[model samples]
Target: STGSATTTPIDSLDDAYITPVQIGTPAQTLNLDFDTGSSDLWVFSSETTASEVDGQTIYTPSKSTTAKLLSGATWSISSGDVYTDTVSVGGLTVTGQAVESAKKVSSSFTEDSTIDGLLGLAFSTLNTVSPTQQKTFFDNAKASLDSPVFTADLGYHAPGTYNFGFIDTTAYTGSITYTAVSTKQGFWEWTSTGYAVGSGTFKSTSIDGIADTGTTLLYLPATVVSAYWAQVSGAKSSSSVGGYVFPCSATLPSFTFGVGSARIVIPGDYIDFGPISTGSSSCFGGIQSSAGIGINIFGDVALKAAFVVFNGATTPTLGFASK
Candidate 1:
């Protein structure tokens, strides 16, 4: 089976990308964030607090005849009750897919009305469910798929696509470079060979990080992050606003990272994320220090520059190609 889903940015900032997912009978459609960094297909549901429901759509299991309680199965991604139901995306469908219904959500989730829930695409080992962890939609759907793979084509302030089961040959340019993925951390973790700032010389280094679709920005080691910011005039690591910010007029250098022998360049415009505040002239840098996050994350900022493939073959691999 194959599926092709359109993904849209939640806002102009491109903070998060959401894809339509149909759950249960009669199809309770919700815009879910396809997070490759986490594992737990959870949703805002009738069980969530009324006050916390904001403007997002909620999945009501009672309305679907196919919805069946998973008995004692539960998940801790914001304390969710589990259910198995028919979940479909684009043209692909998965029967008896675990649908975690959130009973409680935090302030961060309550504030985001654009995302009704999150559909995890990472390795199932990272699933937060207790006793027996549930397989992600991708995992459950893999067996019947034409190929055990999915591709994320994230855009900047534009619509992208998430293609499952097969690779879109026309979606990218040049040859794709494949790298081995280490699921030790339950992430699409890989080693970046090196990096170069703009037209600067490439510096050989082994940087280990995850390609995280759930995250908003590109986070790297402080040394690499600081060097990028230093190139921009008046750029500094802001304490109050958090992360690196620079004068709105500052010219940013494009960032280049290595994937085996391949080099993917992130345009300077992509790094100028947005203003620090609604009306503030200070702009936040998309590339920031990953010290706080503990691990480097190649988020949307980095992913948008290329066509990324998450191959779920027996020996998982990640593929990157220019577009």
Candidate 2:
């Protein structure tokens, strides 16, 4: 159960691109947000408190005939129960995949009715299963795969696909120039040779960040963020509203990042996110400062602007090309 298979990702409420994943023996399917930021295939389960369940469709491992609760399994990722189940994404399947069932959930997760759980695509080292850490779905299936690779093709409110174990040449145009990946912090971190605001001059400074598909907005250094927003006439860095907020109709400047050999520039229009409120004067930005997070993150908003290849061919490297 290897090779490559494509799974359709639905643009789930403008926040994430979610794919249908199968769990348990008879394939009790759940729509999961395939997150590359974190590792641990966790689900909203029957074990979750009744009050915490909210609108999610919980996975009843008890109802599933083949569910096996791992004895004395305590996960460090969260206070959750661990079990082994048959997990499948498209044609790829893992027989004894660790499935963490949440006993509790955060408000951000509970409020999102679409995201039933998360199927992490990050390295196995990031998995939080205690006593014995478990392998990710990718790691478990890697030995049988034709090529140790997976590709993400996300679009703005449009159809996208996650191709496992192989890259589809047809999905993207031009050559995929690759850059070395540094997984020190258990993430797909890469170095960008600085960036530029609009048609402004390119800075040669290095910017280190992660390709986090789970995150919705792009997070960069505060100085880089301020320069971009400053190009917009009515933009302001508001303390009360969190990040930079601006007039919805403001002309956003283009933002570009240097990917070693190449540069990927996001259009000016892409900088302005939807209105702050339903019909408010201000609008939330698609890009923000990575002040609190310690490191910057190249989230879905930035990643969607290019055709990226998460190359696991030799060393974990990221390939980028124009869409």
Candidate 3:
């Protein structure tokens, strides 16, 4: 009964986001956008630089000569902009798949912006060629498949599908928890017994920097973002729409993640916030303040409630469920 209501707007900063997957061949389809924060894989190059490739979507390896590029392949992508090429898309074919090509394009990758690329299933030695050896199309399709694990059913933006090999647990009805993969920062982080700042819910502060899909809000760390707006009693600071702005009726707390058997909950109208400014009131768009980018991402407002499963073929775990 619900199929026509796709609203993905929540990008205070995570680089004009987008999420609509189905990469390579589910029948030769292509609507990619699932960037676990950064690993590079581009799309937009007819020589690029068309005003910085305005509004993205440009992968003309002549359409797809099986799409390959990796030629000298010297890559670099520290965080928000540093690109290098050498492409490849699904069905397994790697000749160097580390692309970013400076993503300042937009229109969410295309509408008239012209579409074509972006499918970097993170954790591929962090791609760009060097220590980035090229192995992330879900870790080379989970090394040829046998249930090496890979699932990302974003559902929110509609079309969120990336099921390499297995993990179709009936699409998900809920109940499937397991989180213990933080081998000292390979990313897929865990731990969150506290965080719900706007509506207040801080319990000792530990919130570690969680997972990400190229971010879309939810980055806490300035002492839990000023102790979560000091419990929003009257919330006011607005360095011109940066953080802390009450009166959506305030009273917000409700954000858990514990992840092990499940406790994913994140409801508070999904962190309120809606009317940008004009009598300005509906605030609480995810307690920001990590702009220095030292950690804590968990974007897409905590991956759209949760149902992720990115087990990078042994020890790179991240399997929480509740959809």
lDDT of each: 0.94, 0.83, 0.55
lDDT of 1 by residue, 1-323 (tens): 99999999999889899999999989999999999999999999999989888999999999999999999998996787899999999889999999999999988999999999999999999998877789999999999899999999999889999999999999999999999999999999999999999889999899999999999999999999988888888999989988899999888899999999999999999998778878888999999999988999999999999999999999999999999
Name the candidate, 2 or 3, with the larger lDDT value: 2
Ranking by TM-score: 1, 2, 3
lDDT score at residue 198, model 2, on the 0-100 scale: 87
Worst 10 residues of 1 by lDDT: 272-281
Give the Cα RMSD of candidate 3.
15.9
lDDT of 2 by residue, 227-251 (tens): 8888888888888888899988777
Worst 10 residues of 3 by lDDT: 1-10
Ranking by lDDT: 1, 2, 3
- Give residue 6's lDDT in candidate 1 (0 to 100): 99
Residue-level lDDT tens digits of model 3 in 1-323: 00111123224322323433222212233334556655555555555556655554444444444444455444444212323223223333333334444334554444434234456666665566553355555564455565776666654434345555567677666667766667455556776555443334435445667678656677877676666566656766678776767777666665665554346776655655555666666565665778578887877766776778777656677787877
C-alpha lDDT of candidate 2 relative to the true structure? 0.83
Q: In candidate 3, which residue ranges exceed 4 Å CA deviation?
A: 1-34, 37-54, 63-94, 98-108, 111-134, 137-189, 193-210, 219-230, 233-245, 248-279, 287-297, 300-323
Give each model a TM-score: 0.99, 0.94, 0.34
**What is the Cα-based TM-score of model 1?**
0.99
In angstroms, give how far residue 108 of model 3 lies from its true place: 5.1
